[PDB]
A paper describes a structure:
The C-protein binds at various sites within the C/R promoter to regulate transcription of its own gene and the associated endonuclease gene. Unusually, in the RM system Esp1396I, the C-protein also represses the MTase (M) gene by binding to the promoter at the transcriptional start site, denoted OM where the C/R genes and the M gene are transcribed convergently from different promoters.
The Y37A and Y37F mutants had KDs that were 11 and 3.5 fold higher than the wild type respectively. The three-fold difference between these two mutants indicates that both the phenyl ring and the hydroxyl group of the tyrosine are important for interacting with the DNA. SPR analysis showed that Y37F formed much more stable complexes with the OM operator site than Y37A, with KDs of 1.8 and 5.5 nM respectively, but both were less stable than the wild type (KD = 0.51 nM). This indicated that the role of the tyrosine was more than just the formation of a hydrogen bond with the DNA backbone, but also involved the phenyl ring common to both tyrosine and phenylalanine. The free protein structures of the wild type, Y37F and Y37A mutants showed no major structural differences either in the local binding regions in terms of helix or side chain positions, or in the overall fold. The ΔΔG for the phenyl group alone (comparing the values for Y37F and Y37A), is −2.8 kJ mol−1 (−1.4 kJ mol−1 per monomer). In terms of crystal packing interactions, the Y37A crystal structure is identical to the triclinic wild type structure but adopts loop conformation I in both monomers in the asymmetric unit.
Residue numbers in the entry:
A (entry chain A), B (entry chain B): 3 to 79
The structure:
Amino acid sequence: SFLLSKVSFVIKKIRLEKGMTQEDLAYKSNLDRTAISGIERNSRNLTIKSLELIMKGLEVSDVVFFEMLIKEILKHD
Amino acid sequence: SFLLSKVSFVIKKIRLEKGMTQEDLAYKSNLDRTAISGIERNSRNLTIKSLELIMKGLEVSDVVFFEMLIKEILKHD
Protein backbone atom coordinates (compact mmCIF):
# COMPACT_ATOMS: atom_id res chain seq x y z
CA SER A 1 0.00 0.00 0.00
CA PHE A 2 0.98 3.61 -0.51
CA LEU A 3 0.59 4.87 3.08
CA LEU A 4 2.63 2.45 5.13
CA SER A 5 5.40 2.46 2.53
CA LYS A 6 5.42 6.25 2.78
CA VAL A 7 5.42 6.26 6.54
CA SER A 8 8.47 3.90 6.50
CA PHE A 9 10.20 5.95 3.85
CA VAL A 10 9.77 9.14 5.85
CA ILE A 11 10.99 7.42 9.11
CA LYS A 12 14.12 6.25 7.35
CA LYS A 13 14.69 9.62 5.57
CA ILE A 14 14.49 11.56 8.88
CA ARG A 15 16.63 8.99 10.84
CA LEU A 16 19.47 9.36 8.25
CA GLU A 17 19.17 13.18 8.15
CA LYS A 18 19.66 13.12 11.91
CA GLY A 19 22.63 10.84 11.42
CA MET A 20 21.21 7.98 13.35
CA THR A 21 21.63 4.27 13.12
CA GLN A 22 18.81 1.79 13.52
CA GLU A 23 20.27 0.81 16.93
CA ASP A 24 20.37 4.46 17.98
CA LEU A 25 16.68 4.92 17.04
CA ALA A 26 15.71 1.70 18.66
CA TYR A 27 17.19 2.83 21.91
CA LYS A 28 15.66 6.34 21.75
CA SER A 29 12.20 5.09 20.59
CA ASN A 30 11.87 2.27 23.12
CA LEU A 31 11.28 -0.24 20.27
CA ASP A 32 13.65 -3.18 19.47
CA ARG A 33 16.11 -2.96 16.60
CA THR A 34 14.30 -5.77 14.77
CA ALA A 35 11.11 -3.74 15.15
CA ILE A 36 12.73 -0.68 13.63
CA SER A 37 14.16 -2.77 10.74
CA GLY A 38 10.75 -4.35 10.20
CA ILE A 39 8.91 -1.03 10.05
CA GLU A 40 11.49 0.49 7.82
CA ARG A 41 10.76 -2.43 5.48
CA ASN A 42 7.00 -2.38 6.08
CA SER A 43 5.03 -0.05 8.32
CA ARG A 44 1.62 -1.79 8.15
CA ASN A 45 1.80 -3.04 11.74
CA LEU A 46 3.21 0.12 13.26
CA THR A 47 0.78 1.43 15.89
CA ILE A 48 0.06 5.11 16.39
CA LYS A 49 1.58 4.94 19.89
CA SER A 50 4.79 3.52 18.51
CA LEU A 51 4.91 6.07 15.73
CA GLU A 52 4.77 8.76 18.41
CA LEU A 53 7.64 7.00 20.29
CA ILE A 54 9.59 7.05 16.92
CA MET A 55 8.97 10.73 16.43
CA LYS A 56 10.23 11.48 19.93
CA GLY A 57 13.30 9.35 19.17
CA LEU A 58 14.01 11.14 15.91
CA GLU A 59 13.41 14.40 17.87
CA VAL A 60 10.99 15.60 15.21
CA SER A 61 7.62 17.17 16.02
CA ASP A 62 4.52 15.33 14.89
CA VAL A 63 3.49 18.28 12.74
CA VAL A 64 6.85 18.21 10.81
CA PHE A 65 6.64 14.45 10.32
CA PHE A 66 3.10 14.75 8.95
CA GLU A 67 4.10 17.64 6.73
CA MET A 68 6.91 15.61 5.26
CA LEU A 69 4.58 12.61 4.87
CA ILE A 70 2.05 14.82 2.97
CA LYS A 71 4.79 16.43 0.80
CA GLU A 72 6.07 12.90 -0.05
CA ILE A 73 2.60 11.66 -0.87
CA LEU A 74 1.68 14.75 -2.95
CA LYS A 75 4.90 14.99 -4.90
CA HIS A 76 5.30 11.27 -5.54
CA ASP A 77 1.83 9.67 -5.48
CA SER B 1 -1.23 9.28 24.69
CA PHE B 2 -1.21 12.57 22.83
CA LEU B 3 -0.93 11.61 19.16
CA LEU B 4 -3.60 8.92 19.34
CA SER B 5 -6.04 11.24 21.15
CA LYS B 6 -5.86 13.73 18.28
CA VAL B 7 -6.12 10.96 15.68
CA SER B 8 -9.19 9.63 17.52
CA PHE B 9 -10.67 13.15 17.63
CA VAL B 10 -10.15 13.66 13.84
CA ILE B 11 -11.76 10.27 12.99
CA LYS B 12 -14.85 11.07 15.02
CA LYS B 13 -15.01 14.62 13.66
CA ILE B 14 -14.88 13.47 10.07
CA ARG B 15 -17.26 10.54 10.74
CA LEU B 16 -19.95 12.93 12.16
CA GLU B 17 -19.35 15.63 9.47
CA LYS B 18 -20.16 12.87 7.02
CA GLY B 19 -23.26 11.84 9.00
CA MET B 20 -22.05 8.30 9.37
CA THR B 21 -22.71 5.94 12.27
CA GLN B 22 -19.98 3.89 13.96
CA GLU B 23 -21.69 0.77 12.54
CA ASP B 24 -21.41 2.24 9.03
CA LEU B 25 -17.75 3.14 9.47
CA ALA B 26 -17.00 -0.27 10.93
CA TYR B 27 -18.52 -2.04 7.95
CA LYS B 28 -16.80 0.21 5.36
CA SER B 29 -13.47 0.10 7.19
CA ASN B 30 -13.29 -3.66 7.87
CA LEU B 31 -12.99 -3.00 11.65
CA ASP B 32 -15.42 -4.22 14.31
CA ARG B 33 -17.87 -1.67 15.71
CA THR B 34 -16.31 -2.46 19.17
CA ALA B 35 -12.98 -1.50 17.63
CA ILE B 36 -14.23 1.79 16.18
CA SER B 37 -15.86 2.73 19.49
CA GLY B 38 -12.69 1.98 21.39
CA ILE B 39 -10.53 4.02 18.95
CA GLU B 40 -12.84 6.96 19.35
CA ARG B 41 -12.92 6.43 23.13
CA ASN B 42 -9.15 6.54 23.23
CA SER B 43 -9.28 3.12 24.91
CA ARG B 44 -7.56 1.47 21.93
CA ASN B 45 -4.40 1.76 19.80
CA LEU B 46 -4.63 1.57 16.01
CA THR B 47 -2.17 0.46 13.32
CA ILE B 48 -1.35 2.53 10.29
CA LYS B 49 -3.00 -0.09 8.12
CA SER B 50 -6.07 0.24 10.30
CA LEU B 51 -5.94 4.00 9.96
CA GLU B 52 -5.61 3.56 6.22
CA LEU B 53 -8.77 1.40 6.05
CA ILE B 54 -10.59 4.02 8.19
CA MET B 55 -9.71 6.77 5.79
CA LYS B 56 -11.07 4.69 2.93
CA GLY B 57 -14.18 4.05 5.07
CA LEU B 58 -14.51 7.81 5.70
CA GLU B 59 -13.81 8.42 1.95
CA VAL B 60 -11.18 11.03 2.79
CA SER B 61 -7.67 11.20 1.34
CA ASP B 62 -4.76 10.57 3.66
CA VAL B 63 -3.44 14.06 2.85
CA VAL B 64 -6.73 15.66 3.87
CA PHE B 65 -6.77 13.51 7.04
CA PHE B 66 -3.23 14.48 8.00
CA GLU B 67 -3.87 18.10 7.22
CA MET B 68 -6.86 18.01 9.51
CA LEU B 69 -4.73 16.33 12.18
CA ILE B 70 -2.04 19.07 11.78
CA LYS B 71 -4.60 21.90 12.07
CA GLU B 72 -5.97 20.17 15.20
CA ILE B 73 -2.57 19.81 16.85
CA LEU B 74 -1.55 23.33 15.79
CA LYS B 75 -4.64 25.30 16.73
CA HIS B 76 -5.47 23.35 19.85
CA ASP B 77 -2.25 21.68 21.01
